Amino acid sequence: QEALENAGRLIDRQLQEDRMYPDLSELLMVSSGMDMDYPLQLLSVPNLPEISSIRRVPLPPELVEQFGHMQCNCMMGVFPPISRAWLTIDSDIFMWNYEDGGDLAYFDGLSETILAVGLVKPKAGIFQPHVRHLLVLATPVDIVILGLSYANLSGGMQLLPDPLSLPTDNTYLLTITSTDNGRIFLAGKDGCLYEVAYQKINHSKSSL
Amino acid sequence: QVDLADKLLQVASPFLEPHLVRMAKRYMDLLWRYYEKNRSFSNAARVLSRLADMHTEISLQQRLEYIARAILSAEFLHELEEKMEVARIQLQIQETLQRQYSHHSSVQDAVSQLDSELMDITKLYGEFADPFKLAECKLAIIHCAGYSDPILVQ
Amino acid sequence: ALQYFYFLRDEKDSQGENMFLRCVSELVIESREFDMILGKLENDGSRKPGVIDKFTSDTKPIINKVASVAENKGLFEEAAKLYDLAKNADKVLELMNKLLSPVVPQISAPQSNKERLKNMALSIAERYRAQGISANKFVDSTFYLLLDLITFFDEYHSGHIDRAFDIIERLKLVPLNQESVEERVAAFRNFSDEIRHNLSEVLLATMNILFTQFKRLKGIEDRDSQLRSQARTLITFAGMIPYRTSGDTNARLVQME
Amino acid sequence: ENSESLDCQLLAVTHAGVRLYFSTCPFRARPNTLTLVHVRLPPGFSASSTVEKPSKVHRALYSKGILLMAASENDNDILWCVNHDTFPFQKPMMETQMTAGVDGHSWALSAIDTPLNKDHIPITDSPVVVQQHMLPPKKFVLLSAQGSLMFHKLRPVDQLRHLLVEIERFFKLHQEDQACATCLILACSTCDREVSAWATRAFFRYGGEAQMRFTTLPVYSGKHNGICIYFSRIMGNIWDASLVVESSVPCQLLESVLQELKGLQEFLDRNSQFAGGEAQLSEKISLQAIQQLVRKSYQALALWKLLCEHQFTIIVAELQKELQEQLKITTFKDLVIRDKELTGALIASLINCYIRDNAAVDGISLHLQDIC
C-alpha cells in the first residue's frame, strides 16, 4: 500500500526479470537455418547497424621510421589490457599508445630476433605479484619477462626487466598463452605443448 | 554569405542603411544586425517589436528578450507593453501545460502555437483557459482585457 | 569600561538595569571593539566569550543592531564578524561571496599567501562547511567557485602555466571543447551576479598561459593544435559577450604576436 | 565462458566461415570429449553461401557471440560483423550482419573494452539492454598494417535516435515498454538536439498519434514500466550492495548517481501533472510511488554526497554500538526505502561534531527538520 515499498517491489521484480533473460545460445534457436538480417551493403542496415567506424589512426611515422629496416621478420599486434599496440621488426620491439601515438616505448634489451610477444598476468605469489601485467618476449635464444605498469605521476608507461632469462634455444617458440593462474604455456615449433614456471625451467606437459 | 555580417555593422557607407532597410523583411540576422545597428533607441525598439510580432519561428523566450530589449529602449510604448503582457500570459499557460497531466506529449502542437506567436486574447481565453481550466490564467487575462462584468468575473 | 558599567546593576531594580544595558550597548556601538566586547572565532566551539558575555544575556540583539549599522557604513568585515556571532551562517557566506567576488575582478599583482578577504574566504569554508552546514547549497557553490578561481590566481604567475589551464577548465565556466562556446553563452546570463562579473579575468588568464605556454618551441609529438583550439573557442566566447563585459577585448593583443 | 553458456566450451570458425559449437563436461581429473552442439552458416544470403569464403584466422568472436569476420576473397578483403539482436533475443534468436568499412588486410582484432555482458550466469548474460547504462561503451580494435581502426557498438539509445522520426520499428522488435524507457532516456539525455528531446518526450508522453497509444488496460502502461526499468537499471549495481564497509562506493560514483537521479527527479517533478491525477487510478498510484521513490533516492544520495566531504570515518568507528551489526549490513536499497532512526542519530552526530562544514551543516539541520 505504501508507495515507497510498492515502488521498491516493482523495481525488484523488474530486476529479476532482467536477470532471468534467456540464454544467448541454444541449438533449438537455429536448428532450422539461421534468422539473418544480412546486408552486403556499409550502413545497409540503417537503424540497426551493430557497429560503426568511429576513427582510424595511422601508425605514426615516427614509429614506422624505426621499422624501416627489417631483413628477417615483422609482426604486430594490439595488447588488449594496455590499449597499446606493438610492432616487432627483427630484434626490436615498439609499444605505442593507442590514444596518443606520440608516446611510444622501445625495447633495447633484446639482442636477438623476437619470435613472439605476449601479455600475461602475474602469478599469485611471486615478488612481482603486484604488477598489473607482464610482458613475455621470446627470441630464438631466450625468453624474457618484463613488467608493465602505469606511472600514476606522469601516467607514462613503465617497463622494468624482471631479470628472468629462460634458455629456449631449440624451441623456436611459436606461441605463448597464459592461464590466469599465472601459469604460462607456450609451444615451440616442437609439437603441441610446453609450460614455463618463473617460480626459469621448462617442463613439457605432453611428456617429452 | 561569408557570414561576414558582423562586419556589416561596422560599415559606415550611406548605402548601407537602405540596404538593411530593404532586406529587413536568415534575415533575422539582418535584423539582429539592424536593431543593434541603430544606435538610436527609438529606431532600435521599433525593429525588435516587429521582430517579436513577426510571422519566422522565433521562440517566445527570444520574443520576450526582444521585448525586454525593446522596452529597455523606452504609442509605440503602448503597443510594446501590451505585447509584453500578453506574451507573459502565454509563458504562464505554457508552463502550466507542462505540469498538467491531462495533456499528451504528442499534442506538442499547442506549445508550438504558444511559443510561435502572440495570440488573440479571446483565442487565448476560449481556446486555452477554458478547455484547460486554467482559472488563474483566465482571470489574469481578463485583467488585461479589463473586463469589468462582475458576474462573469465572480 | 565594561567592569565599571557593570556596577550600575549594583543598584538593583529596573530602570537602572536598562540604563546598564543601554550603556553597554552604547559602549559597543561607536567603540567598535567587537572582538573584545562581543566575542570571536568559532572553530566550531561557539563563541569564545567577549568580556560582556562573561557578564551575559542580551547580546544577540545588540549584535544585530551593530551589524545592521555596519551595513549602513559599509564596514564589511565587521558585518561578517558580527553575523558570525549572530550565527547567521547563510548571511555570512553571502556577504563573504560579495567581498571575495569583487577584488577578484580588477587588475593583477596581489594576493600574498597569508591574510585578507581571500584568506577570510578560506577560513569560513573550512570552518562551516564541514560542520552541519546551515547555508544554502547555492550560496556554498558560488563560494567554492570563488575559492577555485583564487587558487587559479595563486598559481597564475609564479609560473605553473600548465597547472592554470587545468584548473580553469575544471571550473566548467569556459569552453575548452568545441564551438560549444555558444552554450557558454546560453549559460552566462543564467550565471549568478558574483561570477558574471569575474569572467573578464577568467578570459585573458586563459589567453596568457595559452600564449606563454604555446611559445613557439625550438626544434616527437608536439600537439600545439590543442591549447590553440582553446584560444579559438575562448575568443568566439569573448566575441559573443563583449557588450556584457567591461570592455576590454584586448584579448586580441595577447592573442597575437 | 561457462558464464555465457554452461555447456558450450568452444566455437570453431572454419575457412568457409562456418561456426561450430561444441559442448563438454569437465570433472575435477577428466575432460569429456567435445560434442558438436550446433552449427551456423554464413549468409551468402543463406546456407550454400561462399560469401565468407575465404575466412582468415584474423576473425574472432567477441564475448557475447559477436562475430568479426575477416574474409579474403580469392577479388579483395572484406570485413563483416554479426551481432545478435539481443533485444528480439528476449526469446527468438536473430543476428544482424553487415559489411564494414575496412578494406585493408586485417592483421588482428581485439576488444579495447570489458564486455557488456550483464550477468555472470547464463541467465541474463546477454542482456545488453539492462547493462546499456552501466557497461562501458564497447569499442573494438581492428589492426591493419596501415593503421588502427576503431569500431563502436551502437546502443539502443542510438537506434531509437535513428528511428526518432519512425519508432514503430523499435517498438516492434524491442517492445513498447523498452521503447518508452529509451524514449525517457533520450528526453533526459544531455547535448541532444531540441528536436530529438522534444520528439522523444512526445513519444513518451503521447506515443504515436492515431497509431500506438500509451495505456493501462484492465496492467500498467508502458510509461510506468519504462520509467521503472530506467530507474532499476541505473541503480542495479549498487542496489543490493552494502552501503558501509568507509563507503562501499567512491565519491566520484556517488556524484555520478546523484547527478543522474537529479536529472530524473527534475524531469518527473516537472511533468508530474501529466502522470498523476481502476486502471487509470492504478496508473496514477504506481507513478506517484515511483516518483516518490526517485526523490527518496535523491535524498539518500544527497546525504552521502555530504558525508564524502570529510571526517566521516572517524565518527563511524566511534559511534557504532550494538546496533552496529544492523548498520553494517545495510544495503543501498535499505536507504532507498529508509531506516530512519539510525540515520537521524548519525546525522545529528555529524552536525553536533565539527565534521560538517559551513553550508553542509545547515543542510542537515534543514533535513532533520524537514524529514526527521
PDB file of C-alpha atoms in Angstrom, chain C:
ATOM      1  CA  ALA C   1      34.784  50.313  30.881  1.00  0.00           C
ATOM      2  CA  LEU C   2      32.707  47.174  30.961  1.00  0.00           C
ATOM      3  CA  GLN C   3      33.732  46.493  34.523  1.00  0.00           C
ATOM      4  CA  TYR C   4      32.565  49.928  35.592  1.00  0.00           C
ATOM      5  CA  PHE C   5      29.321  49.834  33.663  1.00  0.00           C
ATOM      6  CA  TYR C   6      28.519  46.528  35.320  1.00  0.00           C
ATOM      7  CA  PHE C   7      28.403  48.257  38.718  1.00  0.00           C
ATOM      8  CA  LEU C   8      25.281  50.061  37.566  1.00  0.00           C
ATOM      9  CA  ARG C   9      23.345  46.848  38.274  1.00  0.00           C
ATOM     10  CA  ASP C  10      24.543  47.079  41.845  1.00  0.00           C
ATOM     11  CA  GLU C  11      21.514  49.306  42.254  1.00  0.00           C
ATOM     12  CA  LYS C  12      19.054  46.512  41.825  1.00  0.00           C
ATOM     13  CA  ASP C  13      15.806  47.460  40.109  1.00  0.00           C
ATOM     14  CA  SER C  14      14.569  48.037  36.609  1.00  0.00           C
ATOM     15  CA  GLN C  15      15.427  51.384  35.060  1.00  0.00           C
ATOM     16  CA  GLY C  16      18.930  51.062  36.359  1.00  0.00           C
ATOM     17  CA  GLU C  17      19.137  47.686  34.714  1.00  0.00           C
ATOM     18  CA  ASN C  18      18.109  49.163  31.400  1.00  0.00           C
ATOM     19  CA  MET C  19      20.462  52.042  31.969  1.00  0.00           C
ATOM     20  CA  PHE C  20      23.203  49.481  32.335  1.00  0.00           C
ATOM     21  CA  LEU C  21      22.130  47.702  29.196  1.00  0.00           C
ATOM     22  CA  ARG C  22      21.899  50.905  27.245  1.00  0.00           C
ATOM     23  CA  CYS C  23      25.301  51.940  28.468  1.00  0.00           C
ATOM     24  CA  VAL C  24      26.850  48.685  27.347  1.00  0.00           C
ATOM     25  CA  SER C  25      25.007  48.917  24.072  1.00  0.00           C
ATOM     26  CA  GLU C  26      26.309  52.426  23.695  1.00  0.00           C
ATOM     27  CA  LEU C  27      29.782  51.217  24.546  1.00  0.00           C
ATOM     28  CA  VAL C  28      29.785  48.537  21.872  1.00  0.00           C
ATOM     29  CA  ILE C  29      28.485  50.913  19.307  1.00  0.00           C
ATOM     30  CA  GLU C  30      30.984  53.639  18.396  1.00  0.00           C
ATOM     31  CA  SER C  31      33.803  51.979  20.274  1.00  0.00           C
ATOM     32  CA  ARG C  32      33.528  49.236  17.708  1.00  0.00           C
ATOM     33  CA  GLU C  33      35.635  46.959  19.839  1.00  0.00           C
ATOM     34  CA  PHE C  34      33.594  43.987  18.718  1.00  0.00           C
ATOM     35  CA  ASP C  35      36.044  41.195  19.282  1.00  0.00           C
ATOM     36  CA  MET C  36      36.897  42.307  22.759  1.00  0.00           C
ATOM     37  CA  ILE C  37      33.392  43.215  23.735  1.00  0.00           C
ATOM     38  CA  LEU C  38      31.249  40.667  21.837  1.00  0.00           C
ATOM     39  CA  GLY C  39      33.412  37.611  21.254  1.00  0.00           C
ATOM     40  CA  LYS C  40      35.336  35.899  18.430  1.00  0.00           C
ATOM     41  CA  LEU C  41      36.127  32.880  16.149  1.00  0.00           C
ATOM     42  CA  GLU C  42      34.161  29.712  16.362  1.00  0.00           C
ATOM     43  CA  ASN C  43      36.395  26.748  15.410  1.00  0.00           C
ATOM     44  CA  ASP C  44      33.087  25.080  15.977  1.00  0.00           C
ATOM     45  CA  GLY C  45      33.041  25.651  19.757  1.00  0.00           C
ATOM     46  CA  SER C  46      30.519  28.524  19.523  1.00  0.00           C
ATOM     47  CA  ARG C  47      31.850  31.914  20.521  1.00  0.00           C
ATOM     48  CA  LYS C  48      34.893  32.499  22.594  1.00  0.00           C
ATOM     49  CA  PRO C  49      33.304  34.783  25.018  1.00  0.00           C
ATOM     50  CA  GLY C  50      33.801  38.504  24.964  1.00  0.00           C
ATOM     51  CA  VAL C  51      34.094  40.397  28.198  1.00  0.00           C
ATOM     52  CA  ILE C  52      30.424  41.315  28.200  1.00  0.00           C
ATOM     53  CA  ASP C  53      29.361  37.742  27.567  1.00  0.00           C
ATOM     54  CA  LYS C  54      31.110  36.804  30.714  1.00  0.00           C
ATOM     55  CA  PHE C  55      28.632  39.170  32.336  1.00  0.00           C
ATOM     56  CA  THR C  56      25.957  37.772  29.900  1.00  0.00           C
ATOM     57  CA  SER C  57      22.497  37.918  28.333  1.00  0.00           C
ATOM     58  CA  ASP C  58      21.208  40.423  25.773  1.00  0.00           C
ATOM     59  CA  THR C  59      23.973  40.102  23.343  1.00  0.00           C
ATOM     60  CA  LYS C  60      22.267  38.691  20.326  1.00  0.00           C
ATOM     61  CA  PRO C  61      20.046  41.744  19.863  1.00  0.00           C
ATOM     62  CA  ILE C  62      22.962  44.072  20.314  1.00  0.00           C
ATOM     63  CA  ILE C  63      24.820  42.177  17.644  1.00  0.00           C
ATOM     64  CA  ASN C  64      22.050  42.538  15.128  1.00  0.00           C
ATOM     65  CA  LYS C  65      21.904  46.229  15.885  1.00  0.00           C
ATOM     66  CA  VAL C  66      25.628  46.678  15.470  1.00  0.00           C
ATOM     67  CA  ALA C  67      25.747  44.519  12.373  1.00  0.00           C
ATOM     68  CA  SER C  68      22.997  46.392  10.623  1.00  0.00           C
ATOM     69  CA  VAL C  69      24.830  49.605  11.394  1.00  0.00           C
ATOM     70  CA  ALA C  70      27.957  48.097   9.953  1.00  0.00           C
ATOM     71  CA  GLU C  71      25.899  47.583   6.843  1.00  0.00           C
ATOM     72  CA  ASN C  72      24.997  51.255   6.695  1.00  0.00           C
ATOM     73  CA  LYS C  73      28.590  52.318   6.952  1.00  0.00           C
ATOM     74  CA  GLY C  74      29.600  49.538   4.673  1.00  0.00           C
ATOM     75  CA  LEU C  75      32.072  48.351   7.200  1.00  0.00           C
ATOM     76  CA  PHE C  76      32.304  44.938   5.660  1.00  0.00           C
ATOM     77  CA  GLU C  77      34.430  42.565   7.747  1.00  0.00           C
ATOM     78  CA  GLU C  78      32.778  43.976  10.810  1.00  0.00           C
ATOM     79  CA  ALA C  79      29.485  42.882   9.364  1.00  0.00           C
ATOM     80  CA  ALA C  80      30.833  39.462   8.554  1.00  0.00           C
ATOM     81  CA  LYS C  81      32.318  39.244  12.011  1.00  0.00           C
ATOM     82  CA  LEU C  82      29.075  40.341  13.584  1.00  0.00           C
ATOM     83  CA  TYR C  83      26.963  37.921  11.597  1.00  0.00           C
ATOM     84  CA  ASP C  84      29.213  35.053  12.579  1.00  0.00           C
ATOM     85  CA  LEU C  85      28.429  35.827  16.201  1.00  0.00           C
ATOM     86  CA  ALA C  86      24.806  36.257  15.188  1.00  0.00           C
ATOM     87  CA  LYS C  87      25.190  32.791  13.777  1.00  0.00           C
ATOM     88  CA  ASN C  88      23.506  33.808  10.589  1.00  0.00           C
ATOM     89  CA  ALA C  89      25.661  31.427   8.609  1.00  0.00           C
ATOM     90  CA  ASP C  90      23.885  31.940   5.339  1.00  0.00           C
ATOM     91  CA  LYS C  91      24.171  35.681   5.672  1.00  0.00           C
ATOM     92  CA  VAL C  92      27.843  35.434   6.416  1.00  0.00           C
ATOM     93  CA  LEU C  93      28.670  33.482   3.328  1.00  0.00           C
ATOM     94  CA  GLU C  94      26.604  35.738   1.123  1.00  0.00           C
ATOM     95  CA  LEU C  95      28.279  38.903   2.343  1.00  0.00           C
ATOM     96  CA  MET C  96      31.505  36.985   2.045  1.00  0.00           C
ATOM     97  CA  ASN C  97      30.894  35.957  -1.528  1.00  0.00           C
ATOM     98  CA  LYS C  98      30.372  39.593  -2.383  1.00  0.00           C
ATOM     99  CA  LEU C  99      33.586  40.642  -0.717  1.00  0.00           C
ATOM    100  CA  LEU C 100      35.646  37.977  -2.387  1.00  0.00           C
ATOM    101  CA  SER C 101      33.783  38.392  -5.660  1.00  0.00           C
ATOM    102  CA  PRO C 102      34.855  41.944  -6.130  1.00  0.00           C
ATOM    103  CA  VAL C 103      38.568  42.245  -5.576  1.00  0.00           C
ATOM    104  CA  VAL C 104      38.642  39.225  -7.761  1.00  0.00           C
ATOM    105  CA  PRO C 105      37.790  41.258 -10.846  1.00  0.00           C
ATOM    106  CA  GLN C 106      40.354  44.049 -11.173  1.00  0.00           C
ATOM    107  CA  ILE C 107      43.982  44.219 -12.206  1.00  0.00           C
ATOM    108  CA  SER C 108      46.802  41.942 -11.096  1.00  0.00           C
ATOM    109  CA  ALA C 109      49.729  41.998  -8.657  1.00  0.00           C
ATOM    110  CA  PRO C 110      48.431  40.999  -5.294  1.00  0.00           C
ATOM    111  CA  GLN C 111      47.401  38.219  -3.067  1.00  0.00           C
ATOM    112  CA  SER C 112      50.190  37.314  -0.703  1.00  0.00           C
ATOM    113  CA  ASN C 113      49.556  33.831   0.549  1.00  0.00           C
ATOM    114  CA  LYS C 114      48.778  34.916   4.042  1.00  0.00           C
ATOM    115  CA  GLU C 115      45.821  37.227   5.080  1.00  0.00           C
ATOM    116  CA  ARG C 116      42.818  39.108   3.749  1.00  0.00           C
ATOM    117  CA  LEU C 117      39.435  38.546   2.095  1.00  0.00           C
ATOM    118  CA  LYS C 118      40.691  35.511   0.293  1.00  0.00           C
ATOM    119  CA  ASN C 119      42.193  34.232   3.487  1.00  0.00           C
ATOM    120  CA  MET C 120      38.892  35.077   5.125  1.00  0.00           C
ATOM    121  CA  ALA C 121      37.216  33.023   2.457  1.00  0.00           C
ATOM    122  CA  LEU C 122      39.343  30.065   3.261  1.00  0.00           C
ATOM    123  CA  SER C 123      38.620  30.389   6.966  1.00  0.00           C
ATOM    124  CA  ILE C 124      34.862  30.288   6.644  1.00  0.00           C
ATOM    125  CA  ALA C 125      34.672  27.424   4.148  1.00  0.00           C
ATOM    126  CA  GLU C 126      36.904  25.071   6.056  1.00  0.00           C
ATOM    127  CA  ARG C 127      35.189  26.157   9.142  1.00  0.00           C
ATOM    128  CA  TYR C 128      31.451  25.992   8.381  1.00  0.00           C
ATOM    129  CA  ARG C 129      31.122  23.593   5.514  1.00  0.00           C
ATOM    130  CA  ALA C 130      32.321  20.509   7.278  1.00  0.00           C
ATOM    131  CA  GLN C 131      30.041  21.155  10.220  1.00  0.00           C
ATOM    132  CA  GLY C 132      26.294  20.600   9.788  1.00  0.00           C
ATOM    133  CA  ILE C 133      26.375  23.432   7.252  1.00  0.00           C
ATOM    134  CA  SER C 134      23.211  25.554   7.516  1.00  0.00           C
ATOM    135  CA  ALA C 135      23.964  27.542   4.387  1.00  0.00           C
ATOM    136  CA  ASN C 136      22.170  27.265   1.082  1.00  0.00           C
ATOM    137  CA  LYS C 137      23.752  24.943  -1.433  1.00  0.00           C
ATOM    138  CA  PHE C 138      23.696  27.715  -3.993  1.00  0.00           C
ATOM    139  CA  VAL C 139      25.450  30.056  -1.645  1.00  0.00           C
ATOM    140  CA  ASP C 140      28.127  27.489  -0.906  1.00  0.00           C
ATOM    141  CA  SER C 141      28.566  26.671  -4.553  1.00  0.00           C
ATOM    142  CA  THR C 142      29.433  30.192  -5.536  1.00  0.00           C
ATOM    143  CA  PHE C 143      31.729  30.223  -2.550  1.00  0.00           C
ATOM    144  CA  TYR C 144      33.704  27.250  -3.774  1.00  0.00           C
ATOM    145  CA  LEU C 145      33.876  28.686  -7.256  1.00  0.00           C
ATOM    146  CA  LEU C 146      35.345  31.881  -5.918  1.00  0.00           C
ATOM    147  CA  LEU C 147      37.909  29.879  -3.990  1.00  0.00           C
ATOM    148  CA  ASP C 148      38.795  27.834  -7.048  1.00  0.00           C
ATOM    149  CA  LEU C 149      39.280  30.956  -9.082  1.00  0.00           C
ATOM    150  CA  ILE C 150      41.540  32.301  -6.329  1.00  0.00           C
ATOM    151  CA  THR C 151      43.743  29.215  -6.274  1.00  0.00           C
ATOM    152  CA  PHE C 152      43.993  29.685 -10.019  1.00  0.00           C
ATOM    153  CA  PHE C 153      45.291  33.159  -9.274  1.00  0.00           C
ATOM    154  CA  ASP C 154      47.890  31.922  -6.834  1.00  0.00           C
ATOM    155  CA  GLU C 155      49.300  29.620  -9.450  1.00  0.00           C
ATOM    156  CA  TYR C 156      48.756  32.104 -12.260  1.00  0.00           C
ATOM    157  CA  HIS C 157      52.123  33.810 -12.381  1.00  0.00           C
ATOM    158  CA  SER C 158      54.641  32.306 -10.043  1.00  0.00           C
ATOM    159  CA  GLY C 159      54.901  30.139 -13.125  1.00  0.00           C
ATOM    160  CA  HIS C 160      52.872  26.979 -13.362  1.00  0.00           C
ATOM    161  CA  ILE C 161      51.316  27.870 -16.694  1.00  0.00           C
ATOM    162  CA  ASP C 162      50.225  24.325 -17.326  1.00  0.00           C
ATOM    163  CA  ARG C 163      48.524  23.990 -13.979  1.00  0.00           C
ATOM    164  CA  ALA C 164      46.457  27.111 -14.549  1.00  0.00           C
ATOM    165  CA  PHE C 165      44.789  25.749 -17.647  1.00  0.00           C
ATOM    166  CA  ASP C 166      43.874  22.555 -15.909  1.00  0.00           C
ATOM    167  CA  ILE C 167      42.177  24.348 -13.063  1.00  0.00           C
ATOM    168  CA  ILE C 168      40.406  26.887 -15.234  1.00  0.00           C
ATOM    169  CA  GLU C 169      38.936  24.099 -17.295  1.00  0.00           C
ATOM    170  CA  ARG C 170      37.760  22.389 -14.132  1.00  0.00           C
ATOM    171  CA  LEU C 171      35.708  25.468 -13.385  1.00  0.00           C
ATOM    172  CA  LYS C 172      33.476  24.411 -16.244  1.00  0.00           C
ATOM    173  CA  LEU C 173      32.863  28.079 -16.943  1.00  0.00           C
ATOM    174  CA  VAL C 174      34.848  28.462 -20.176  1.00  0.00           C
ATOM    175  CA  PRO C 175      34.505  26.407 -23.329  1.00  0.00           C
ATOM    176  CA  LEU C 176      37.627  24.289 -23.786  1.00  0.00           C
ATOM    177  CA  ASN C 177      35.936  21.797 -26.078  1.00  0.00           C
ATOM    178  CA  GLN C 178      34.473  22.606 -29.442  1.00  0.00           C
ATOM    179  CA  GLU C 179      32.418  25.520 -30.651  1.00  0.00           C
ATOM    180  CA  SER C 180      30.265  24.861 -27.563  1.00  0.00           C
ATOM    181  CA  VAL C 181      31.284  28.490 -26.889  1.00  0.00           C
ATOM    182  CA  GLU C 182      27.668  29.383 -27.576  1.00  0.00           C
ATOM    183  CA  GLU C 183      26.356  27.007 -24.987  1.00  0.00           C
ATOM    184  CA  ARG C 184      28.652  29.050 -22.805  1.00  0.00           C
ATOM    185  CA  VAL C 185      26.567  31.988 -23.978  1.00  0.00           C
ATOM    186  CA  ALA C 186      23.336  30.326 -23.055  1.00  0.00           C
ATOM    187  CA  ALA C 187      24.873  29.587 -19.752  1.00  0.00           C
ATOM    188  CA  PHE C 188      26.162  33.036 -18.980  1.00  0.00           C
ATOM    189  CA  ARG C 189      23.106  35.150 -18.444  1.00  0.00           C
ATOM    190  CA  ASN C 190      21.980  32.445 -16.037  1.00  0.00           C
ATOM    191  CA  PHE C 191      25.194  32.960 -14.074  1.00  0.00           C
ATOM    192  CA  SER C 192      24.948  34.469 -10.653  1.00  0.00           C
ATOM    193  CA  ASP C 193      25.820  38.106 -10.347  1.00  0.00           C
ATOM    194  CA  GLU C 194      29.004  37.372  -8.462  1.00  0.00           C
ATOM    195  CA  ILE C 195      30.508  35.145 -11.170  1.00  0.00           C
ATOM    196  CA  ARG C 196      29.067  37.059 -14.102  1.00  0.00           C
ATOM    197  CA  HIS C 197      31.396  39.853 -13.001  1.00  0.00           C
ATOM    198  CA  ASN C 198      34.530  37.648 -12.648  1.00  0.00           C
ATOM    199  CA  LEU C 199      34.568  36.150 -16.154  1.00  0.00           C
ATOM    200  CA  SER C 200      36.553  39.034 -17.632  1.00  0.00           C
ATOM    201  CA  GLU C 201      39.727  37.881 -15.909  1.00  0.00           C
ATOM    202  CA  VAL C 202      38.964  34.233 -16.445  1.00  0.00           C
ATOM    203  CA  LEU C 203      39.291  35.022 -20.082  1.00  0.00           C
ATOM    204  CA  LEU C 204      42.704  36.594 -20.721  1.00  0.00           C
ATOM    205  CA  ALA C 205      44.102  34.463 -17.936  1.00  0.00           C
ATOM    206  CA  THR C 206      43.401  31.668 -20.349  1.00  0.00           C
ATOM    207  CA  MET C 207      44.774  33.697 -23.186  1.00  0.00           C
ATOM    208  CA  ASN C 208      48.098  34.226 -21.488  1.00  0.00           C
ATOM    209  CA  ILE C 209      49.059  30.847 -20.184  1.00  0.00           C
ATOM    210  CA  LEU C 210      47.810  29.711 -23.537  1.00  0.00           C
ATOM    211  CA  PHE C 211      50.161  32.218 -25.138  1.00  0.00           C
ATOM    212  CA  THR C 212      53.203  31.757 -22.913  1.00  0.00           C
ATOM    213  CA  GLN C 213      52.927  28.008 -22.766  1.00  0.00           C
ATOM    214  CA  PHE C 214      52.497  27.960 -26.503  1.00  0.00           C
ATOM    215  CA  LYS C 215      55.590  29.956 -27.045  1.00  0.00           C
ATOM    216  CA  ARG C 216      56.726  28.678 -30.367  1.00  0.00           C
ATOM    217  CA  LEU C 217      59.179  25.989 -29.442  1.00  0.00           C
ATOM    218  CA  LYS C 218      62.662  25.406 -30.694  1.00  0.00           C
ATOM    219  CA  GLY C 219      63.448  22.290 -32.658  1.00  0.00           C
ATOM    220  CA  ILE C 220      58.445  13.784 -31.485  1.00  0.00           C
ATOM    221  CA  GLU C 221      54.929  14.664 -30.579  1.00  0.00           C
ATOM    222  CA  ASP C 222      54.019  18.291 -30.189  1.00  0.00           C
ATOM    223  CA  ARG C 223      50.331  18.886 -30.224  1.00  0.00           C
ATOM    224  CA  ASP C 224      50.276  22.650 -30.499  1.00  0.00           C
ATOM    225  CA  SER C 225      46.864  22.297 -32.043  1.00  0.00           C
ATOM    226  CA  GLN C 226      45.275  21.980 -28.665  1.00  0.00           C
ATOM    227  CA  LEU C 227      45.909  24.950 -26.406  1.00  0.00           C
ATOM    228  CA  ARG C 228      45.249  26.646 -29.703  1.00  0.00           C
ATOM    229  CA  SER C 229      41.750  25.450 -30.276  1.00  0.00           C
ATOM    230  CA  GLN C 230      41.178  26.545 -26.721  1.00  0.00           C
ATOM    231  CA  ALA C 231      42.088  30.100 -27.557  1.00  0.00           C
ATOM    232  CA  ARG C 232      39.790  29.961 -30.567  1.00  0.00           C
ATOM    233  CA  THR C 233      36.768  28.816 -28.631  1.00  0.00           C
ATOM    234  CA  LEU C 234      37.578  31.334 -25.957  1.00  0.00           C
ATOM    235  CA  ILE C 235      37.744  34.153 -28.494  1.00  0.00           C
ATOM    236  CA  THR C 236      34.427  33.206 -30.006  1.00  0.00           C
ATOM    237  CA  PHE C 237      33.138  33.283 -26.465  1.00  0.00           C
ATOM    238  CA  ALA C 238      34.656  36.698 -25.802  1.00  0.00           C
ATOM    239  CA  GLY C 239      33.362  37.841 -29.156  1.00  0.00           C
ATOM    240  CA  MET C 240      29.834  36.909 -28.208  1.00  0.00           C
ATOM    241  CA  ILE C 241      29.865  38.661 -24.884  1.00  0.00           C
ATOM    242  CA  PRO C 242      31.851  41.844 -25.121  1.00  0.00           C
ATOM    243  CA  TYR C 243      28.894  44.070 -24.525  1.00  0.00           C
ATOM    244  CA  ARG C 244      28.046  42.259 -21.371  1.00  0.00           C
ATOM    245  CA  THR C 245      31.631  42.704 -20.323  1.00  0.00           C
ATOM    246  CA  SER C 246      33.669  45.631 -19.062  1.00  0.00           C
ATOM    247  CA  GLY C 247      35.017  46.393 -22.472  1.00  0.00           C
ATOM    248  CA  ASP C 248      38.427  45.001 -22.938  1.00  0.00           C
ATOM    249  CA  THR C 249      38.663  42.702 -25.839  1.00  0.00           C
ATOM    250  CA  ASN C 250      42.309  43.405 -25.592  1.00  0.00           C
ATOM    251  CA  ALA C 251      42.478  39.670 -25.502  1.00  0.00           C
ATOM    252  CA  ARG C 252      43.448  40.422 -29.050  1.00  0.00           C
ATOM    253  CA  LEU C 253      46.727  41.937 -28.002  1.00  0.00           C
ATOM    254  CA  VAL C 254      47.700  38.879 -26.054  1.00  0.00           C
ATOM    255  CA  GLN C 255      46.082  36.685 -28.706  1.00  0.00           C
ATOM    256  CA  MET C 256      48.518  37.629 -31.428  1.00  0.00           C
ATOM    257  CA  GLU C 257      52.210  38.268 -31.683  1.00  0.00           C
TER     258      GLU C 257
END
